[PDB]
Amino acid sequence: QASVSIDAKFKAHGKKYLGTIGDQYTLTKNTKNPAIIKADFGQLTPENSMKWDATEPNRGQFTFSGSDYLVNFAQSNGKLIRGHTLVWHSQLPGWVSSITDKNTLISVLKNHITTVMTRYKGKIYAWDVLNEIFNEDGSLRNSVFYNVIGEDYVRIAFETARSVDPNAKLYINDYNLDSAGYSKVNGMVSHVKKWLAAGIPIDGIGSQTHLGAGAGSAVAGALNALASAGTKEIAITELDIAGASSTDYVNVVNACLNQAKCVGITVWGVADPDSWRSSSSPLLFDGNYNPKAAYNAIANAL
Template sequence: MAGRARTVLVVLASGLLVILGGCSSPQPDVTIDLLRENWKDVTGVTAGGDGLQVTASARSIVGQDGRGGQPDPPLNLAGTHLMVGGDFTLSATFADMTADASWALYDKPPVIADEFRVEPAGLRLTLQGKELDIAVFDGTQNKDLARPVPMHDERVTLNNPEAPLTVHRSGDTLTVASGGETLTSLALGKVFSSGRLWLGFSSDSGGFDVTSLTAAAPRSAGLRTSGAAAADVWQSEDGLQALAAKTRPDLRIGAAVALGPLSSDEDYARVLVGNFGSITPENAMKPQFLSPRQGVYTFEEADAIIAMAQSKGMIVHGHTIAFTEAMPRWMRELPSGTDAERKSSAAALLDYVTTVVTHFKGRLDSLDVVNEPFDVDQGTSFQQNIWYRVFGSGYPAVVSKAVYAADPAVKQFINENGADVPGRRQDALRKLASDTNAQGGHLYGVGLQAHVYDIGTDAISAGDLSKTLDAFDAAGLRVRISENDVTDDQGTDTQAQQYATVLAGCLRSRACVSYTTWGVDDRYDWSIDHDGNLRQGHDFLFHDGQPTPAYDAMRQVLGG
């Protein structure tokens, strides 16, 4: 029988299943107990002396129109992930399952938008009773992002669901086993090619305990744990914020951020922390991300973003409280047909406001208390959302007063699109802000989003911006340029000129207290086009970690 390779299964005392191809593969000699690592910022996961307790968080992403509900199970983003350059073995043991138990292993975090989640390459194991679903994703996206299609999907029956579940990579082969029994073995393809492993546990409708969780690998694989990418980077003395401080020390240059790239992408973390003095959580503070079920709050990811910002000396702008989109289904479906229903729903909405603002009290410099109140067709009528149906046209004042009662120090803004240039929509926004304060509100100013999706129709001229800022200044209102991004459809030089025009206008006006661009790097500039296809944009200041001409133009405006 010489020349035929043998496969030997070895079960270690820890319960790890090690698959040895032939007699030449050594046993793992680096082992990490992952239960002792950092899990404190993972939604639905609580670390205790006996392991991890996992409860259902009901996190999902609802579309702009309120339909759908793509599952959004959490990963350990701000805490511990693994670095490994070769073969590895991971093992987990579940106990006290009340429904389903899911274990995810990805080689990078998903990209999260306010409307969809882009599933990365990785593995998801879901156990319910004795049935184990094994789904392997290679990162390929189908047209329906809400229903990602795995490259491999099968269901197997376990003899003992309390036995350790084991995931093993050996060369180009991925093996899943339970209690010493191989369940499936398949070609890896693109899966686990990044040299990193991001872990998460979740349940759709119940809870369970993780009583053991280990990682092992040959010493040559370089297995180790790592934290968030932003931990080891600092503001540059030559970055955008540092340059602005030389002429306008009161002006903050900011960007919208997401926890996934902030934790996993060294380029993203470097250019963000190096250049910006403030951040806006892109999605993590929107209602559907903070409260997926009524009375249930999932603050962990927002807390992690804020903690990172504070550790780097950055201020945080909160986004957002009252908003037609990005609402969880429970909030959208609050009744409003009768006086009694409106009274009950008002109590639920105000409880949400008080709980959220109290939780973040003292950690936010400013906050969008109302976001995009006017209709989406660029008119001046209110969107008929739950806030309007419950409180009427005076709802911004109601929300503002509730925010002030919970945190009187946070600066309050109404944020709107399409009001960047003089016209009826801008006049309506200025009147709404003034009326809100006349009704007892506490608005500090307005946010002008300054999205330039089409240079031909959306471009903001220096003259129009100057008139706009003067008009709000005369009304006693401060202005944030709150979400500036610019298409490159007419070339990067035109894009750069538009970026520079907006920043220069803000820099010259005492009314403009901050400038924020709605993103950092084009790697994460994703949207769904009119045909339902995933589309990557090129609207930001950096591309794959490198500055664009728009960034250089911004530096020139700031004297760099």
């Protein structure tokens, strides 16, 4: 645990949190990881336990051991939770992707959303209701949901989520929304404007922010562009930067800081060895679970 908490410093500027991720393994693999989470971060997103493959492996049969653990740890330690994720083309069981009848898929979708959200009703700050539903060009991804139900799946997902847990902020999350003017950014904005105008309850836009070295400075403009979609809020949801340079990390932190709609940042992992992109050493803590230069840079920029 770093003596200075970047989450505490971020909150002092009016932000909701500066968080990270976890699940049973990383929370128990050693003593430093959970200690770092409790001391320096104020929010948690389950890395995998809440995804469709892990929660409803078979039709109508749910498995909540792993998600229960993450939620219970977060709640027992004063950490906000971002549920992740409800509807996604990846990490989706074959029983779902093989469905071809529209009403059947809708029933399945609603039951999945309802069962998962009901179990953690009132304990979730925000839910990534929809994940990665856009092609790079801004058009809608031809996932099973889009192919079988059509664009109406967006309304169905959000309305169902809103009804099940009105306390949670409902988000649409995506990657490559990293610079103003990018086709995917433009598509996100135009679709969300349309959906909101149609009465669909979308509270926020989540920008994954999985970056390469030197890409941090473009984030400020991206958030500004995303702000025009008209949602109540936005958030950097899965932050990691190849090389973890101080300039890049400070640039991203400042991007959120200077944008009213950005409620917080979630770094996708604590220490490099546990990163899904470990070969790029993209996190704030090293192989010894010690704070890297970027962590201190962030602490001193706040």
